[PDB]
């Protein structure tokens, strides 16, 4: 596989050089990205192979600039002739677009000319038959857990490697390799004329960082069985815990609200909040783009800009926007290396377990799953479908579904009571469960 | 028809009909029920205006072949981002390994049959000049800004695709399509006394960009849509808190048809029902909606975003009655699930591209009109919501819970529409909510050409539709 990957890497590097050279005579600047992803995706049904999918995807993207006019083109064909056509397409477009001085290649002084090795590449030679056996093991462990499990949506195993190369007309040309492997199962349980489905999974850059198939199956069944016989709450106001998985998404809404694109367009409810307290004064959000093997580690952003260790929130204070080249120029600032998103967020727990948070809350709603969109970028208004558990006397009483929770993110974030030690570790943003003092719950 | 696509996809890439025979033969060396070869090329453009200038433009090209081998429940799948004999051979040889056992090698002779055309074969990317395309956007910007002094920002985009497909299969299917699709999107920001809000409009379909300059009720369509985005932004700017709880909800005609897409649409896709994982599994012949409700999925509609002259397996699009006077009639199928359920293809076998597997997917999903006027429906509510527009939604087909979120909504008080209210997510159970439909309007319309549907990571263009209707009890996710 490493001979295959090194061969792909050389091909991609030449493709970037070729595109940049073809552009150089007819543009003031150009940026070129190429990627290749290869691997396998398999599923099982009742422990037998269902699907075997062989994946092989490639792509080349180019943006060129002339008189501050921009044009872009892309192709999945990396032959020299296809590259020539893609370059000419982008150049032709830039004859019709308008001069826009905030457009252009990222600032030379911010580029990752010598990009760090973040050890993202841990390939595995997994045959389809071996992949199938892993999926089957996870699914069978789920199906054997309890006699109320009566159907399946299957086991699934995925293993891929990727090569990405970026270059631009300031002389940057840097590339890196990565791997991702994952294993999941999803089953259906029934009780008293009600069906429920849930899943469990494990993910990592190295095969030896995964949970066992049998762990996945046990987790899948536990989650699925816990959903049985839900109640629809009556309409009320109560405290709400966002369980760790959805709590990561609660902090996730911050990304849109502090993105430079939203800020310069005045389309964020946090427009006037830079340097002000938006979160509790003990809460810090640490960004760590250079974690070795990190799930969202990156040696540079999508415009080739260096990434840095940053405290996005420090002691409840919003310290910075998330800027790209274009939005930074619009605001008179410099890129913070956030083209393409955020790069590993970490929020520490304040010392309580999940069980202790339930005791602290006493009576209230725990949300474990949210449905729908219902979050306004410009106002912060929040209205989402929810499922979870009702808590009374500090103990889970029954599952709940067919309800909504509503409020405003500005209020929700400012008034967080505590964050748990039960940290979710499979995601970009990693935190524990989050206690909110009050939300409007719509139901019966 | 087939000829033109076959020259572009096969002949231009050094392939003939007999190469198709040979590759399908390679698949049939194993013990399969079915195998297919799916050829595609597509060309996508987009242009974006913001801050009164043309900021961005893009041109995107894709091409490839996907090859499937199917045996009962099982699919092997491989593909390549090129159209060549070697790509075909490599793909077929990988995909057939789904089963180890030898097959009888029997395949039906390849034979194309006529289908009805549903949209032009003229390339929309080439049929209008770039200067005229960009003038559509400039017009949108000018009209929006002239509509109200509070308009501070307008983003307007034009997006077009031209797509050629050819499918050849072991059951003798040989079919081709030429698929145009265009979309105009408008978003506006309004400001008053330091408060800001946004509004949006747009649509399109399977035709050229000239559609945006044609007449809509006595005005130029793009002017009308520019004005609509401004109107929506101004409604939202004035909106007050929505009420929380269970109440009557009156849904407008058209895009509020998202109701159907979420509450029944996905639940009636044959893959979920074959597996027994949908709440509708085994329920054919039962009352799954009020007796006032007839719900169809219709791939035959001339020029529409959601239509399929052929689906991605070569099956001509069909008018499929799913629910008739409240009674479940059947499911949307692809070839695989049809065989496994002992049913027949319905024209719902769709894939995002050559690089993805087809499955049962919606086309244009709507409710047939009834006898009530929209005014009668509004007048019947003492206290509730009127919601003439929505964003998107979501459904859990197993537990039968679904949501959809309002983008324009109002209180109804004493049978009159009163105060505009803020965006709220509405939640219910699919079958139970459909059973609460007590009034069905005489004013059926489909959406303007905006639908995007997701399933298993695959995005597709869809349509939805309905008349004005009344749900007697639905949970509204307000704060007040
Ligand atoms: Zn959908």
* Closest by Cβ to A443, choosing from B196, B393, B475: B475
How many whole angstroms from A386 Cα to the centroid of ligand 1?
A: 19
Cα–Cα distance for residue pair A55/A241, rounded to 1 Å = 40
Resolution of the experimental model in angstroms, please? Answer: 1.9
Q: Judge contact between B466 and B260, C-beta under 8 A.
A: yes
Contact across the interface for B479 and A443, Cβ inside 8 Å: no
Using the Cα atoms of residue A253, residue A258, residue A264 and residue A267 in order, give the sign of their dihedral. Answer: positive
Contact across the interface for A372 and B64, Cβ inside 8 Å: no
Contact across the interface for A384 and B477, Cβ inside 8 Å: yes
Q: For residue A72, list chain B residues with Cβ-Cβ distance below 8 A.
A: 56-59
**Strands A29-45 and A48-66, sheet pairing:** antiparallel
Distance from CA of B368 to the nearest CA of A (A): 26
C-alpha pair distances (Å), B145 with each of A195, B154, B186, B223, B241: 52, 8, 12, 11, 28
How many whole angstroms from B469 Cα to the centroid of ligand 1?
A: 21
Q: Judge contact between B361 and B350, C-beta under 8 A.
A: yes
CATH of the domain at B93: 3.30.2290.10
B291: tokens are 């007796």
Length of chain B: 480
How many whole angstroms from A107 Cα to the centroid of ligand 1?
A: 42
Residues 207-266 of A with CB under 8 A from B: 227, 230, 235, 265-266
Q: Give the 3-state secondary structure of chain A.
A: CHHHHHHHHHHHHHHHHHHHHHHHCCCCEEEEEEEEEEEEEEEEECCEEEEEEEEEEEEEEEEEEECCEEEEEEECCCCHHHHHHHHHHHHHHHCCCCCCCCCCCCCHHHECCCCCCCCCCCCCCCCHHHHHHHHHHHHHHHHCCCCCEEEEEEEEEEEEEEEEEEEECCCCEEEEEEEEEEEEEEEEEEECCEEEEEEEEEEECCHHHCCCHHHHHHHHHHHHHHCCCCECCCCEEEEEEECHHHHHHHHHHHHHHHEHHHHHCCCCCCCCCCCCECCCCCCCEEECCCCCCCCCCCCCCCCCECCCCEEEEECCEECCCECCHHHHHHHCCCCCCCCCCCCCEECCCCCCCHHHHHHHHCCEEEEEEEECCCECCCCCEEEEEEEEEEEECCEEEEEEEEEEEEEEHHHHHHCCCEECCCCCCCCCEECCCEEEEEEEEECC
Q: Which residue of A has its CA nearest to B155?
A: A265
Q: Judge contact between B394 and B402, C-beta under 8 A.
A: yes
Q: Which of B403, B278, B259, B249 is nearest to A403 (CA)?
A: B403
Q: For residue B477, list chain A residues with Cβ-Cβ distance below 8 A.
A: 374, 383-385, 404-406, 442
Q: What is the count of residue pairs from A and B with beta carbons less than 8 Å apart?
A: 218
How many whole angstroms from B352 Cα to the centroid of ligand 1?
A: 13
Quote the crossing angle between the two packed helices A213-226 and A128-143, to the nearest 10°.
40
Q: For residue B245, list chain A residues with Cβ-Cβ distance below 8 A.
A: 235, 442-444
Give the residue carrying structure tokens 């849930």. Answer: A198
Contact across the interface for B59 and A371, Cβ inside 8 Å: no
The verdict on A433 touching B (C-beta cutoff 8 Å) is no
- What is the CATH code for A1-230? 3.30.2290.10
* Closest by Cβ to A73, choosing from B59, B63, B77: B59
* Closest by Cβ to B55, choosing from A49, A100, A384: A100
The verdict on A16 touching B (C-beta cutoff 8 Å) is no
* Closest by Cβ to B398, choosing from A99, A197, A444: A197
Q: Which residues are CB-contacts of B442 (< 8 A; sequence separation ≥ 6)?
A: B369, B370, B371, B372, B373, B374, B467
* Domain extents in chain A: 1-230, 231-444
The verdict on A412 touching B (C-beta cutoff 8 Å) is no
* Closest by Cβ to B399, choosing from A86, A196, A443: A196
Distance from CA of B308 to the nearest CA of A (A): 25
């Amino acid at each position: 596989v490493i001979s295959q990957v090194e061969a792909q890497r050389k091909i991609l590097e030449e493709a970037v050089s070729t595109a940049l050279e073809l552009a150089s005579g007819k543009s003031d600047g150009a940026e070129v990205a190429v990627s290749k992803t290869t691997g396998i995706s398999v599923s099982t049904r009742y422990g037998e192979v269902e699907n075997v999918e062989f994946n092989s995807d490639g792509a080349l993207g180019i943006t060129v600039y002339h008189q501050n006019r921009k044009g872009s083109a892309s192709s999945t064909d990396l032959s020299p002739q296809a590259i020539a056509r893609t370059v000419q397409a982008a150049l032709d477009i830039a004859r019709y677009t308008s001069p826009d001085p905030c457009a252009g290649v990222a600032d030379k002084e911010l580029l990752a000319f010598d990009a760090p090795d973040l050890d993202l590449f841990h390939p595995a030679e997994v045959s389809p038959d071996e992949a199938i056996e892993l999926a089957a093991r996870a699914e069978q462990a789920a199906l054997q857990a309890d006699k109320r499990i009566t159907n399946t949506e299957g086991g699934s195993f995925n293993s891929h490697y990727g090569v990405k190369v970026f270059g631009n007309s300031h002389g940057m040309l840097q590339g890196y390799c990565s791997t991702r492997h994952s294993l999941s199962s999803c089953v259906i349980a029934e009780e008293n004329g009600d069906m429920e489905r849930d899943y469990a999974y494990t993910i990592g850059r190295a095969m030896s960082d995964l949970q066992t198939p049998e762990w996945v199956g046990a987790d899948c069944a536990r989650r699925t069985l816990s959903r049985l016989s839900p109640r629809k709450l009556s309409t009320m106001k109560a405290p709400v815990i966002f369980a760790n998985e959805v709590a990561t998404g609660l902090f996730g809404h911050l990304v849109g609200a502090i993105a430079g694109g939203s800020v310069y367009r005045k389309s964020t409810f946090l427009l006037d909040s830079l340097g002000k307290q938006i979160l509790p004064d003990w809460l810090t959000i640490e960004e760590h783009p250079h974690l070795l093997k990190g799930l969202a580690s990156t040696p540079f952003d999508s415009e080739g800009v260096r990434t840095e260790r940053r405290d996005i929130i420090k002691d409840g204070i919003l310290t910075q926007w998330l800027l790209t080249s274009y939005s930074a120029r619009k605001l008179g600032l410099k890129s913070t290396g956030h083209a393409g998103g955020i790069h590993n967020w970490r929020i520490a727990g304040q010392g309580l377990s999940f069980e202790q948070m339930l005791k602290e809350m006493g009576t209230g709603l725990v949300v474990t799953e949210l449905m729908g969109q219902g979050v306004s970028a410009i106002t912060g208004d929040y209205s989402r479908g929810a499922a979870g558990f009702w808590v009374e006397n500090g103990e889970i009483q029954y599952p709940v579904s067919e309800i909504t929770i509503a409020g405003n993110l500005k209020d929700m974030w400012r008034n967080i009571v505590t964050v748990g030690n039960d940290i979710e570790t499979r995601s970009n943003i990693q935190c524990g469960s989050v206690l909110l003092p009050e939300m409007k719950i719509a139901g019966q | 028809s087939l000829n033109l696509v076959s020259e572009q996809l096969l002949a231009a890439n050094g392939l003939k009909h007999q190469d198709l025979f040979a590759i399908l033969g390679q698949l049939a060396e194993r013990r399969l029920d079915y195998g297919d070869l799916y050829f595609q090329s597509s060309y996508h453009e987009s242009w974006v205006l913001e801050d009164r200038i043309i900021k961005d433009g893009s041109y995107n090209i894709d091409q490839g072949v996907g090859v499937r081998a199917i045996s009962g429940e099982k699919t092997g799948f491989a593909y390549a981002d090129q159209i060549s004999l070697l790509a075909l051979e490599q793909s077929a040889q990988a995909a057939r390994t789904i089963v180890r056992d030898s097959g009888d090698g029997k395949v039906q002779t390849l034979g194309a049959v006529e289908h009805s055309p549903l949209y032009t074969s003229v390339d929309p990317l080439q049929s209008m000049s770039r200067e005229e395309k960009l003038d559509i956007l400039r017009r949108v910007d000018k009209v929006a800004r002239e509509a109200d002094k509070r308009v501070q920002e307008v983003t307007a985009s034009l997006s077009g695709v031209y797509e050629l497909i050819l499918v050849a299969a072991t059951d003798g299917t040989l079919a081709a399509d030429v698929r145009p699709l265009v979309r105009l999107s408008v978003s506006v920001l309004v400001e008053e006394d330091g408060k800001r809000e946004r509004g949006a409009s747009g649509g399109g379909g399977r035709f050229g960009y000239e559609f945006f300059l044609a007449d809509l009720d006595g005005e130029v369509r793009a002017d009308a849509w520019a004005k609509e985005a401004v109107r929506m932004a101004l409604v939202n700017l004035s909106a007050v808190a929505a009420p929380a709880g269970t109440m009557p909800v009156v849904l407008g005609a058209g895009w509020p048809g998202v109701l159907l897409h979420e509450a029944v649409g996905h639940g009636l896709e044959g893959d979920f029902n074959r597996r027994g994982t949908s709440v509708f599994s085994g329920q054919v012949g039962e009352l799954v909606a009020s007796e006032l409700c007839t719900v169809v999925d219709d791939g035959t509609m001339v020029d529409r975003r959601g239509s399929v002259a052929i689906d991605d397996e070569g099956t001509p699009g069909q008018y499929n009655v799913l629910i008739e006077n409240g009674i479940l009639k059947g499911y949307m199928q692809d070839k695989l699930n049809a065989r496994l359920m002992g049913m027949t293809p319905t024209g719902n076998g769709r894939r995002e591209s050559y690089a993805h597997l087809p499955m049962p997917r919606m086309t244009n999903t709507y409710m047939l009109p009834g006898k009530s006027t929209p005014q009668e429906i509004i007048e019947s509510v003492e206290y509730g919501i009127y919601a003439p527009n929505f964003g998107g939604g979501q459904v859990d087909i197993t537990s039968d819970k679904f949501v959809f979120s309002t983008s324009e909504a109002y209180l109804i008080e004493n049978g009159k529409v009163t105060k505009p209210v803020k965006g709220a997510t509405l939640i219910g159970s699919g079958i139970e909510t459909m059973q609460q439909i007590s009034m069905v309007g005489n004013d059926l319309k489909l959406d303007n050409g905006v639908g995007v549907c997701g399933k298993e990571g695959q995005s597709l263009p869809v349509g939805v539709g309905q008349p004005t209707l009344k749900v007697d009890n639905l949970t509204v996710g307000g704060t007040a």
